Design a protein around this ligand. Structure first.
Ligand SMILES: CCCCCCCCCCOCCOCCOCCOCCOCCO
Length: 279
């Protein structure tokens, strides 16, 4: 039972979906010219993954730009470096990751929009697992995760209700690996796994003034097919959330988001602070 590799990979993919959310949220904010954006997203939950409880923690720094590329078009490109962990009985794991995120949002005048999202990242999972009495196995595995996203949104309003919904496809290719350091060390084969995710969501923006807005978010998210990262060697979550963009003046804006995702046997706190500069 090397469930620790499946689980850490799963924990990374799950974090990656929120990283993509953040870049896609960055498509909405834009007014005038071109923004440059620096962000920290922290993550923190527990997760029973088929009999095994674990604890994920995660930190991601991102730098990004977004800009009106057209009278009705917005584009964003973000670069993200992540460090996350995953714990279990007997074993824990640290994931390093480097990811590029890209998004385009086309508006149909004021009635709604479509978004395309894409991401390519690499990851490295370092596992150590107690295998005995002061005996550990160390194991190192690389993978690639790609995401593709299509969302449509309408924009009904006294402040603003946007409804938003679509799909995200996660393609994970993970390399073969082998553990050093133990006589009951384990090897595992490469793994390709593609998962469609359905997404649906509500954003209630209320502007406070000319220089600040607060939003509430409620959302739904569910794998539409299998998401098995068990190497050879599906529940709906509700997410509720809060936010606030503020214009500090002289080009600078700030950003605060907090979010909780839940299903049976899953719970994750996601937070986010961003500082921004509009040229
Ligand atoms: C967990 C610790 C990590 C600390 C590191 C901090 C991460 C920062 C990432 C560094 O890169 C920043 C730059 O990212 C910018 C995004 O790329 C924009 C590319 O622009 C394309 C050029 O435009 C052509 C016109 O279409």
């Amino acid at each position: 039972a090397a469930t620790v590799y499946a689980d850490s990979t799963a924990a990374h993919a799950d974090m990656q979906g929120r990283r993509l959310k953040a870049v896609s949220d960055g498509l909405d904010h834009n007014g005038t010219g071109l923004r440059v954006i620096a962000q920290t997203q922290q993550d923190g939950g527990t997760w029973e993954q088929g009999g095994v409880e674990g604890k994920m923690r995660g930190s991601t720094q991102t730098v990004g730009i977004a800009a009106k590329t057209g009278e009705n078009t917005t584009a964003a490109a973000t670069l993200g470096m992540g460090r996350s962990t995953w714990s279990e009985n007997s074993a824990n794991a640290k994931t390093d990751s480097i990811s590029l995120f890209a998004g385009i949002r086309h508006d149909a005048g004021d009635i709604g929009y479509l978004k395309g999202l894409f991401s390519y990242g690499r990851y490295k999972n370092s596992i150590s697992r107690s295998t005995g009495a002061d005996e550990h196995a160390e194991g190192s595995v690389n993978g690639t995760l790609m995401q593709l996203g299509a969302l449509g949104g309408v924009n009904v309003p006294t402040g603003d209700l946007t409804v938003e919904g679509g799909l995200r496809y996660d393609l994970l290719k993970q390399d073969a690996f082998a553990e050093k350091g133990s006589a009951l060390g384990w090897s595992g084969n490469s793994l390709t796994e593609g998962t469609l995710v359905g997404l649906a969501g509500l954003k209630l923006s209320q502007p406070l003034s000319d220089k600040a807005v607060l939003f509430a978010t409620a959302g739904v998210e569910r794998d539409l097919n299998g998401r098995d990262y068990t190497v050879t060697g599906p529940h709906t979550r509700l997410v509720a959330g809060l936010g606030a963009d503020v214009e500090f003046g002289n080009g600078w804006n700030g950003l605060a988001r907090y979010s909780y995702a839940g299903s049976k046997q899953y719970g994750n706190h996601s937070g986010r602070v961003g500082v921004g500069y509009r040229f």
